[PDB]
Amino acid sequence: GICRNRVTNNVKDVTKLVANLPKDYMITLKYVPGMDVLPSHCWISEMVVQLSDSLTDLLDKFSNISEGLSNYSIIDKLVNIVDDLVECVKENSSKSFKSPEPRLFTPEEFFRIFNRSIDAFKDFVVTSDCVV
Amino acid sequence: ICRNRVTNNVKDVTKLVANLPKDYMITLKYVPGMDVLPSHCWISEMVVQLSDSLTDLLDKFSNISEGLSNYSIIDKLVNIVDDLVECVKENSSKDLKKSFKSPEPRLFTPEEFFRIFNRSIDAFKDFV
Amino acid sequence: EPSPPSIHPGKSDLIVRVGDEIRLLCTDPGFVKWTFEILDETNENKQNEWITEKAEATNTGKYTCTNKHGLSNSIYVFVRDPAKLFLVDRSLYGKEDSDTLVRCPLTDPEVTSYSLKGCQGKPLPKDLRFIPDPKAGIMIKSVKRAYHRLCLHCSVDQEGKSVLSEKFILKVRPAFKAVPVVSVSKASYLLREGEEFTVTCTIKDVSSSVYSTWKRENSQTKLQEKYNSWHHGDFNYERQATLTISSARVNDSGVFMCYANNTFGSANVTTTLEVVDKGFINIFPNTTVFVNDGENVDLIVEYEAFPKPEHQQWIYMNRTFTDKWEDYPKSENESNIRYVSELHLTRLKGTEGGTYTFLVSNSDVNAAIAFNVYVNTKPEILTYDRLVNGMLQCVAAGFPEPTIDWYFCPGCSASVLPVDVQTLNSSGPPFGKLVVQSSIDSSAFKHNGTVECKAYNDVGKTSAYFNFA
Amino acid sequence: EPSPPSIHPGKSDLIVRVGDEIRLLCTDPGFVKWTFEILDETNENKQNEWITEKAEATNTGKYTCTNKHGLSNSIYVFVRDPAKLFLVDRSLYGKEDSDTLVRCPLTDPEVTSYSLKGCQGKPLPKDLRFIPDPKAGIMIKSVKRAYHRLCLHCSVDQEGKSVLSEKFILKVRPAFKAVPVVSVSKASYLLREGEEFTVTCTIKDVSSSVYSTWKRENSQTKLQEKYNSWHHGDFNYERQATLTISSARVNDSGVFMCYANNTFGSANVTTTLEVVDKGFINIFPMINTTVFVNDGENVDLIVEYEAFPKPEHQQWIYMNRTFTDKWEDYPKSENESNIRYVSELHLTRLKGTEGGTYTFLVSNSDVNAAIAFNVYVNTKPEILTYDRLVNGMLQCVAAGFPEPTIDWYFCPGCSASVLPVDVQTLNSSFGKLVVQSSIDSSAFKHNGTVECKAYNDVGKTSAYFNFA
């Protein structure tokens, strides 16, 4: 329930941005293993920082459009968010940093994750189940 | 000739281009040396090629209700090149096969690709 | 007599395993050439014996041997490659109601089922019907609009298993089945010489191929038109050709018509333009009104004014007075050049009589129209004295002419008449009330009564009584 | 005495060619553990002898030995690999005004120019100054907002040629340098009990991080608020916490306040609510509802009033019966909070018998109200009847409003005056009052004419008699 306020609702424009991305354009993420399974605190931090890298670069691949909604803008604001999270988290939750291997994802799977990550909040607190 | 066939949904190219990732390589069967000259040794091939290219590129996007989706933008670039690959196969109508052996496919950044697309549209407005 | 060449192998269709040879032998005295051709390629050759050492599925075709007399014989060679079981011209356009070949000819003729399949699960329309031919492709029949952008696959079954070809994406060309839809910005124009006349016509039709033209009524001359066009989806097109005359001259008047010509019909649309050398104002109203002391009355004028009417007003006796007057256009149309103004006079005062006038003007001409409001009144016995020797005088003022009748009998009284010196003097000044002075001699063969002076008027009546003895 | 551990090699910095061994050996009676650590990575080891057989630029770090009393020593090892001459944590955040480290420590300490470079050809901003350190990174100093999203490169020249590191692209966190701007949808509400109350506040600030809140004037309880937020680019953010009361009860009235609060200041904005149990219509006229006029004179009556909800069927009625349409009605303020109206009634040139009692009525979904005016028009007396009474005198009766005065003249007639009067009783008991007055006929003089004068503040009229 902490930091839930840091996630502006520009999150809503992800679906459009996805529609405006070539179904075959493979995006790179350092996918933190088994997150899609559980729990929701064994990764959140890492994935949040990563999504920022990911988002940030993907953002350079576009230029700004005056009239209308550029994927540039959309991404830009997504980036503003994942950063503020990276912060509120490393400022509230306040580990041996070994980074996940890079993986490719279509813009859907990718943003599918992105979305799941923004949900890891709204119910975020301040590592045994991280099993398998 | 045919210049009237090309609608202005072309202006929206600078945008579509702005919305394609600067590294997403578009495949096009470039007709050799068209960029030099003349402007009728290739017009027909490129015009057909473009359609194919644009046509697939269009499949990679989904339709967006509110706003201008690359889909729409492209879908309309497609409608056009198609109509050219029409007026020509009906105005030039001198297609006694002797110039074939379809070009080799080449890769282009959306900007290079659409640059070509643009030059190709210019080829009309002053066509035989 | 002339006879066709003779090619060997004598077979009508030969099949070769990819990687092998194709030896063809034409035997005729007048061998001219060898003619190979597949989808669109086509290779000629000046050698009696045709030979390719290492064949590829792109050799599958029709080798034709032509004589020197214009005769010829030829065999079809299929070169089976388990890799490619299809050769294709992934190009595919088709007119409406026409038939169209899906350019996917076979490499190995001996195949179970040659069929046109839906694309990506989706099933072809139950409507569409086709007829395959391993030497061409599948022939889509009577290609309808609905098949537009439709994608198909050329399918075939070999070894119980069914294989698919690359994807074709049929693009259907409409067949004009109805006349264009043409509309114009403004119906009729009107401007002062020197200004600009620009109007814009809008053609909407199944295709950009329509013919739209700005032709000046009864004149096949070429007009200067600038045009814009758009594509609102499939089989939907919009072009807007706009006509403009920078600084219109008076003779540039008359009608203008927009034309839509397509393989099925025509469409008329005209916009009449009327140029003038200078603005103008015309007025249409009885200009003389009547009323009564206390009565109300509204004055109303109408007029045409171009340009738009500027300063407008109502003045009484060359001076301003009220603001109790409405001004307003008569149609609200976006072509209305006619206006109308009312003036409300509530409960006149009689002394309120006069010539009310209305003035309106534009950037060009000035104008006005005047009204004469004559207000009526009930006579007033301004002075009922007694003359010198012999009679009684009685003057009354009113409007119009106050009638002076005399009564005599004593007073409940009876009436007796007689009239003497009756003269109304007042010509002088303007719109005023008329005064009348009438008297009557007093030589009565009776006495002890009362006489009455009566001043009549269509509005009312007043009177005064005198005496005798 | 307690002494820190001793490590061999007894050097303070050691350099290894990638692919080599690293043998660190701590000699201390109270050995407790080895602790390697580079960027974020961090290891421990309970072994006086630390050994890594085949090195890797990813071993470049600080190995530390700590005693059982909490004492320690430590040598830095550099493992030179020509390929990797940098180790980085492309993550890079920094506060406004505060310094910030570009995480790119060196693998080989012996290099010509450790420096921060312009990313992709361009040049670093003139303003930005920094101070390198092979054991950390380059330390950008005092990161300014304007460095936001800036991408740098860690640079180093080896053998005359300068090499680059992967790219770093610093993100700058603002530092509140002014109070949150705050506003409110509406200023002051007013609703009939039961209606819904809803208002929305707009907090704008350099960062989502603000603190906003809808409290009820003088109260620390918590109010159920729903909100939406946006980002309109760099160092800009907006939030809209909208407060709502479905079906407000009267006791729900009062003031509410929106409060924004960052690390620098506060901002208030209030909005007062006024719930009512039932609507109302209160009226305030101009002056006494008793108007005075004169035949042919004009007069307008004008009333004003509050009304909630908005007024409906308004109209002026003369003697319980409608008449004209010559009356204006209009709101007084045009504000979007106006509850005050005004209605004028134009009586143009009354006719005397036009007097009476004009009323104004207006009403709303609840109450119905009205106010009336008593317009008494004035007239010039009229000599209704001048007869010749029996034995004794003459009688003259006039009618007017108000009370007509009757004075008598006498001298022959251009004539003179002589006063006198006896029986004068004004009968009548609406409007027009009539008076009857007479005077005896016994003057000791003759051959003349007597006149009857009926005076009235408005005017005068008269008739003439004869005597003998």
Ligand SMILES: *[C@@H]1O[C@H](CO)[C@@H](O)[C@H](O)[C@H]1NC(C)=O
């Ligand atoms: C358009 O008008 C008619 C209708 O089809 C046709 O005869 C004509 O040829 C067309 N325009 C011209 C003059 O080519």
Ligand SMILES: *[C@@H]1O[C@H](CO)[C@@H](O)[C@H](O)[C@H]1NC(C)=O
């Ligand atoms: C075209 O002109 C003809 C002249 O006879 C007229 O009858 C017809 O209605 C016009 N077509 C229209 C209205 O589009």
Ligand SMILES: *[C@@H]1O[C@H](CO)[C@@H](O)[C@H](O)[C@H]1NC(C)=O
């Ligand atoms: C001014 O008013 C007089 C009478 O009121 C009229 O005769 C005269 O024509 C007016 N002015 C002019 C000359 O238009």
Ligand SMILES: *[C@@H]1O[C@H](CO)[C@@H](O)[C@H](O)[C@H]1NC(C)=O
């Ligand atoms: C308003 O009155 C109701 C009546 O029971 C009460 O429940 C509610 O708490 C009151 N609200 C306030 C804050 O006065």
Ligand SMILES: *[C@@H]1O[C@H](CO)[C@@H](O)[C@H](O)[C@H]1NC(C)=O
């Ligand atoms: C509201 O009240 C003060 C009035 O002095 C105002 O200046 C300030 O912004 C706010 N402070 C509070 C009450 O939080």
Ligand SMILES: *[C@@H]1O[C@H](CO)[C@@H](O)[C@H](O)[C@H]1NC(C)=O
């Ligand atoms: C006028 O109407 C009122 C009702 O508001 C009534 O009391 C009064 O008697 C009426 N007056 C007359 C004379 O009708």
